[PDB]
Symmetry: none
Subunit: 30 residues, 4 copies
């Protein structure tokens, strides 16, 4: 039910934050 759905979203939320964080990171290193 929502339990699995929640975990799946929490997982990609985290991935997406890593992606953003990575983006601005390289944007500086540049």
């Amino acid at each position: 039910g929502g339990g699995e759905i929640w975990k799946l979203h929490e997982e990609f939320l985290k991935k997406f934050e890593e992606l953003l964080k990575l983006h601005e990171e390289r944007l500086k290193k540049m």
Copy 2:
């Protein structure tokens, strides 16, 4: 699924939009 699972999907798209605006802010100042 049913409109129940939808509340969950909406809940996170909202957190997604939040991350994006913060990201925009960081770039702006950057």
Copy 3:
């Protein structure tokens, strides 16, 4: 950098928001 590089940043945040809405659409129908 200067407001020139800003045009670029804005250009892609816009494409980012576009991907998100499409994603919302898919989930909605899903």
Copy 4:
């Protein structure tokens, strides 16, 4: 200049689409 910035953004735009695409993929397999 904008050339590098552009490529960097095009790179994460692509990554972000893979992420979204992956998300809805697992959302179905569920």
